[PDB]
Write a protein that binds this ligand. Structure first.
Ligand code: 2GP
Ligand code: CA
Length: 104
């Protein structure tokens, strides 16, 4: 079973933890990768009720199991805060335009 299901993509806790560690490290170092400059501030326009406090940052989580290092980011993201706490896993899949919906 999946811990997080983003559309058709299946993720376990280990998948999200691994992606998060990568995103947080780049955040600390003040470095970004890809044309969209990840990791970057996630404003939460959607108004998701995250249990942890802002500010939030989004970083891609890939269905291939590999850590994002540039190129196409896909539709899935892990959202973490300044304390390196996981807020949630979101996706553009099943959401209109560039909006997000939570991965169930
Ligand atoms: N839907 C959405 N996009 C966000 C949010 N925060 C930042 N963005 C960025 O705002 C722009 C319009 O959605 C995009 O460039 C998007 O970045 P990503 O596309 O990298 O997620 C947010 O809370 N919701
Ligand atoms: Ca996996």
């Amino acid at each position: 079973a999946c811990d997080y299901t983003c559309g058709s993509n299946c993720y376990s806790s280990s998948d999200s933890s691994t992606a998060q560690a990568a995103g947080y490290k780049l955040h600390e170092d003040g470095e970004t990768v890809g044309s969209n400059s990840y990791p970057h501030k996630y404003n939460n326009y959607e108004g998701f009720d995250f249990s942890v406090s802002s500010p939030y940052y989004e970083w891609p989580i890939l269905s291939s199991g590999d850590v994002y290092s540039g190129g196409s980011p896909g539709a899935d993201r892990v959202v973490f805060n300044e304390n390196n706490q996981l807020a949630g896993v979101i996706t553009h899949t099943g959401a209109s335009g560039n909006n997000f919906v939570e991965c169930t």
